[PDB]
Short mmCIF file of N, CA, C and O in Angstrom, two decimals:
data_model
loop_
_atom_site.label_atom_id
_atom_site.label_comp_id
_atom_site.label_asym_id
_atom_site.label_seq_id
_atom_site.Cartn_x
_atom_site.Cartn_y
_atom_site.Cartn_z
N UNK S 205 64.63 113.90 12.18
CA UNK S 205 64.49 115.46 11.90
C UNK S 205 65.99 115.90 12.70
O UNK S 205 66.53 115.25 12.78
N UNK S 206 65.30 117.34 12.87
CA UNK S 206 66.59 118.52 13.51
C UNK S 206 65.68 118.05 15.21
O UNK S 206 65.62 118.94 15.13
N UNK S 207 65.65 117.20 15.64
CA UNK S 207 66.07 117.16 17.50
C UNK S 207 67.02 117.14 18.05
O UNK S 207 67.16 118.03 19.52
N UNK S 208 67.93 116.96 17.41
CA UNK S 208 69.31 116.46 18.42
C UNK S 208 70.02 118.07 18.22
O UNK S 208 70.68 118.10 18.76
N UNK S 209 69.55 118.73 17.14
CA UNK S 209 70.07 120.14 17.04
C UNK S 209 69.61 120.88 18.01
O UNK S 209 69.74 122.05 18.41
N UNK S 210 68.28 120.85 18.27
CA UNK S 210 67.83 121.43 19.43
C UNK S 210 68.37 121.53 20.60
O UNK S 210 68.32 122.34 21.83
N UNK S 211 68.26 120.30 20.76
CA UNK S 211 68.53 119.87 22.31
C UNK S 211 70.10 120.52 22.85
O UNK S 211 70.71 120.32 23.53
N UNK S 212 70.74 120.43 21.63
CA UNK S 212 72.45 120.71 21.85
C UNK S 212 72.06 122.37 22.10
O UNK S 212 73.04 122.99 23.16
N UNK S 213 71.28 122.99 21.46
CA UNK S 213 71.78 124.82 21.18
C UNK S 213 70.39 125.49 22.47
O UNK S 213 70.20 126.09 23.20
N UNK S 214 69.42 124.44 22.51
CA UNK S 214 68.32 124.77 23.79
C UNK S 214 69.12 124.50 25.12
O UNK S 214 69.05 125.25 26.21
N UNK S 215 70.45 123.72 25.34
CA UNK S 215 71.26 123.71 26.82
C UNK S 215 72.11 124.39 26.69
O UNK S 215 72.31 125.69 27.49
N UNK S 216 72.76 124.61 25.99
CA UNK S 216 74.04 126.11 25.71
C UNK S 216 73.17 127.01 25.89
O UNK S 216 73.70 128.32 26.58
N UNK S 217 72.20 127.09 25.95
CA UNK S 217 70.88 128.40 26.12
C UNK S 217 71.09 128.55 27.32
O UNK S 217 71.53 128.93 28.51
N UNK S 218 70.51 127.66 28.14
CA UNK S 218 70.27 127.44 29.63
C UNK S 218 72.02 128.32 30.32
O UNK S 218 71.24 128.56 31.55
N UNK S 219 72.76 127.51 29.82
CA UNK S 219 74.07 128.01 30.44
C UNK S 219 74.54 129.46 30.36
O UNK S 219 74.68 129.99 30.97
N UNK S 220 73.78 129.91 29.35
CA UNK S 220 73.86 131.86 28.43
C UNK S 220 73.18 132.38 29.58
O UNK S 220 73.29 133.12 29.64
N UNK S 221 72.07 131.84 29.98
CA UNK S 221 71.78 133.09 31.12
C UNK S 221 72.23 132.94 32.15
O UNK S 221 72.04 133.86 33.40
N UNK S 222 72.36 131.54 32.56
CA UNK S 222 73.57 131.39 34.64
C UNK S 222 74.82 132.84 33.97
O UNK S 222 75.55 133.06 35.01
N UNK S 223 75.00 133.31 32.72
CA UNK S 223 75.94 133.91 32.24
C UNK S 223 75.33 135.34 32.54
O UNK S 223 76.28 136.68 32.90
#
């Protein structure tokens, strides 16, 4: 399914909040 596509966008997000 598309579970690796969520872990990649889910992380770029965590770094997006630190900015």
